[PDB]
Amino acid sequence: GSETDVECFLGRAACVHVTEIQNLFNDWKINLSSLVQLRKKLELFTYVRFDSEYTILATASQLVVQAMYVPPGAPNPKEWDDYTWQSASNPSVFFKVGDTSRFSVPYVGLASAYNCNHMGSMAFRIVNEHTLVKIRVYHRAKHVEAWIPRAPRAL
Amino acid sequence: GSETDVECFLGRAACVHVTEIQNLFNDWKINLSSLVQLRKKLELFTYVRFDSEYTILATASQLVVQAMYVPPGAPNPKEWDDYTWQSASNPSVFFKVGDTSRFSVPYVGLASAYNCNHMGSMAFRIVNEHTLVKIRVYHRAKHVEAWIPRAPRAL
Amino acid sequence: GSETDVECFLGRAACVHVTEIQNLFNDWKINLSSLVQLRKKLELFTYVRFDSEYTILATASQLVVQAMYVPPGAPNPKEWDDYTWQSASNPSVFFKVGDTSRFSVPYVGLASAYNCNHMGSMAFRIVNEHTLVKIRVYHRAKHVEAWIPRAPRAL
Amino acid sequence: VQQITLGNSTITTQCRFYTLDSKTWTTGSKGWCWKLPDALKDMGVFGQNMFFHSLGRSGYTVHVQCNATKFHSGCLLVVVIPEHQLPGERGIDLLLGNLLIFPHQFINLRTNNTATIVIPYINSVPIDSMNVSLMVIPIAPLTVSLPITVTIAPMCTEFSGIRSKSIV
Amino acid sequence: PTTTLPGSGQFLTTDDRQSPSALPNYEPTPRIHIPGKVHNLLEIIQVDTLIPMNVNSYLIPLNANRQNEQVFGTNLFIGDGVFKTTLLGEIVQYYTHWSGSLRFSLMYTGPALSSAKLILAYTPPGARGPQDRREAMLGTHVVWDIGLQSTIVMTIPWTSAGFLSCWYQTSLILPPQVYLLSFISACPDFKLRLMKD
Amino acid sequence: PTTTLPGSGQFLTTDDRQSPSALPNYEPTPRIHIPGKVHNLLEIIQVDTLIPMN
Amino acid sequence: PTTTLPGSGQFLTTDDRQSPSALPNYEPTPRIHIPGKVHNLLEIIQVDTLIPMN
C-alpha cells in the first residue's frame, strides 16, 4: 500500500512544458494547471505544499542552453540581449544540447501552501552568437502535504 | 558447483529483441518465448518467479532514444505523436544513441510466479523532430525461483 | 534571516567580464567596479576582505583555451607567441571549448582588505595553431568580511 | 438540554445566534447557497467588527432547522464547501454524488428535522481580510411547502490589533 | 580511480534522487496547522458517496402496487457502470488492480407512516443474477422493513465482481412515487496496487 | 577528485550489477509455498530416466 | 564502479562548491582589527536616516 501515499500518487515526473528556441528565447510562467493529467489529480485537494525538482531535456535538429529560473515577483526576459540574463540575483544553469540538467526550487509561496500561488518563471535561450532546439521540462513534486479533499471534477 | 545453481543457469544476459527506428516507433510485448535458446532452458520448469534487468543498446547508421516501459494492463503507443509517450504513469529512459541504458523492472505478475504471465511492453522512439537506429535489448533474469521440473522438449 | 548575511548578500556568482578570441588573445585587469550591479552593493562598505572563485565559460561559433591568471605585480601577455604564456610562475588552466573551468584565487592584496587593491589579471588565448570563441567569466566572492558602512550612492 | 442560550440570544434545538431569513422549500426548488462571512456582512455587531477591522479570523456553528409536522416526506443535504468557486444575508436561491466528501449532515423529514455543523477556521494563512460556503440541496423532493431556518453562531473569533495599538 | 558502468547519464522519470537547489539560503513561508491533513489516498475513498444508480439519477424509484418484482439490480464492477463517477470508482480509475471489501448503504425518504419489506440480495462473483424473489431470498440476503429502519448498511465480502439486487416482498403501503438513496464506500481492508494514466 | 581508468562505459554481458527500478514503490504479488522447489540443477539430473537403447 | 546521473557537468550560478586554488602555498597579508565590522546587513538598516519628506 505504498502507492496510495501522496508522495507516490502526486510526486512523479511528468512533461509540464515543451518549447523551441533558434540560434531566440522563450519564457514560461510556471503553472502546473497546463497539464490536464496532473491538474486532474492535484485539483481534488484545496491546499498543497511541495518543493520541486525540474529536469530540463534539450535536443537539437537542423550548443549551450541557459535555462534561468526567475523567483516570484522578479521581471522576465523580453529579448535575447536583455540585462535579466546577465543578472546575478536570478539563478541559471548552463548545459550542453543533447543531455539534461536538474535543479530543485524550494517551496516558493506567500501563503503556507498553494491553493489550486506565484511559483515563478523559467526562461530559455541558447548562448552561442553569430539550428532549432526542443526543450522539454519535467517537474516532480517533492515533500508534498495535502489538506482538504474535494469532489473530483467531471467536466 | 556454482554453475548448476538456477541463478547461474538461467540468470544471464541474452539478446531478446532487435528492432530498427527512423527519424518512427516500435513496441514489443515482452515475451521471453521469442528466443529459443532461453525458452528451451526455461520451459523445463512449470512456474518461475524472477525480477528483471533490461540493458538497451542503440547504434546509428545512414540523437536521443526514449525507451518507455509499459506496465501490464496499460495501453501501448500507436504513433510517434501519441499521448502515451508524454504520460507520467509509464516509466521512460532518455539516452543518447551509441551508448547503453540499464533499468530493472520488479516481478510484475498476477499469480505468485510466471507459468511457461503479462510482463508488459517496451516502446522505442527517437525524440528529435524535423538515420536508422538499431535497438538491441538484453534481458537478465534476477532472483530466480523455479518449482516443478518437466521433461525437456525434443521437437 | 540567512539572506541578510554578507556571504549571502555579496557572495554570489555574477558575469564580470565578456570577451572574444580568434584562431588572438585578450587580457583583463581584474576590477569588480566594471559591473555596476556588484559595485553598487560593494561600495556601501569602505574595506572588504574576500577570497575568490572564477568560473570561466567558453562557447564557439563560425578547441582548447588557456586562461592564465597573473599575480599582482607580474607582467601581462602582449601577443599570442609571448613568453608569459609558457612561464611557470603564473598559474594557467587548459580546458576544451564548450564546457567550463573553475579555480579559486586566495585574498591577494597588500593591505589587510581591499578599499573600494591590485587583484591581478586574467589572459585568454586558444592554443591551437594554423572560429570565434566567446569567454564569460563569473566571479563569486568567498569568506567576505566588511567593516565601515557608507551612504549608498545615488548618482 | 434543549434551550442553548448564547449571549443575548436563546434558541430551541436538539458569540450570538444570527437567524437568516426563513426560506420556503417548495417541491420545485433546487436549493440555496450562503457564502460566509458574506451572509453576515449586514448582521448587526458582527457586520460592524467585520467592516471596521482590516483582518479577522472566525469559526462558525451552523444550525439548520426545518419547522414541520410528522406527515411530510423528502430530504435536504446541508453541506459546507471550503473555498467554493463559480449575495448578502439573502443567499443565492438556486458532481452532486461526490459532495458527501465535504462535511455534511442529511436532514430527512421521515426521521430528522435538524442539522448542526461546527466549522473551524480553514485558510492557507493564519489571519485574513474578511471564505467557506454553505449549501442546502433538496435531494428527495417534498411530498405533502415547508420553512427552512438557518442559524449561524460565529465562535472563537479574533480580529487584528492595529487601530487599537498605541505608538508611545 | 573509478569506471563508469552501463546506463550512465540516462534519465529515468521514476528515479527519485537528491539535487542542488536553484536558490539556496532561503527560508520559505512557515508551516501552519490546517485541519483535515490527507496522509494517504486510501483514507478518502473510505467515505460514503451517492451512487448515480437511476439530481434525479441518484434517486432509486419506489412505487405502490408491485409485489415479487425487482426494484434495482447492478453488477459490482467498480471500474465501469454506475460506480464510474463515485469517489471510489473515480479513484480506482488511477490503479490497475483494486482488491478488497465494500460498504453499500441505503436510505428511505418517503413519509413516516409508509411501510414495505424490501429484500436486498447479494449474488457472489461467478454466478448469474436472480430473476425471481425466490432466487434472491434463497441466496445471501437481508430482509429490510423500511418502516422500522430508515437506513440499511451492507458489507460486501472480499473480492478481486458479483451482482447485487433489491426485490419487493410486500407492496408499498402509502398513507392516504417515493425514493431510496444508495451510497458506496470501501472498508479499511481495500487495497490499491499499480498506478495508471 | 577521481580519474576514469580503461574499460569505462563498456557493456559486459556477464557483469552482474545493481540497477535503478523502472517503477519503484510497488509491492509485487506475494510469494506462496509451491512444493518441489528446485534449488540446484544438480538435484534433477539425479532422478532415473529411461535410456532409448533399442 | 559509479554511474553519472542527470544534470552532470551543469553550471548552476547559485551552487556553492569547493575548488582548487590557482596559486597554493601562499600566506596572504594578515588580518588586523578594523573597528565597526558588519556581520549582518540587518544591523545597518536599524540606524536612523533623514526622510526626504518635503
From Swiss-Prot, chain E:
It comes from the Viruses. It is found in: Virion; Host cytoplasm. Interacts with capsid protein VP0 and capsid protein VP1 to form heterotrimeric protomers. Five protomers subsequently associate to form pentamers which serve as building blocks for the capsid. Interacts with capsid protein VP4 in the mature capsid. Interacts with protein 2C; this interaction may be important for virion morphogenesis. Forms an icosahedral capsid of pseudo T=3 symmetry with capsid proteins VP2 and VP3. The capsid is 300 Angstroms in diameter, composed of 60 copies of each capsid protein and enclosing the viral positive strand RNA genome. This is Capsid protein VP3. It comes from Human rhinovirus 14 (HRV-14). The lineage of its organism: Viruses, Riboviria, Orthornavirae, Pisuviricota, Pisoniviricetes. The chain holds residues 334 to 555 of 2179 of the full protein.
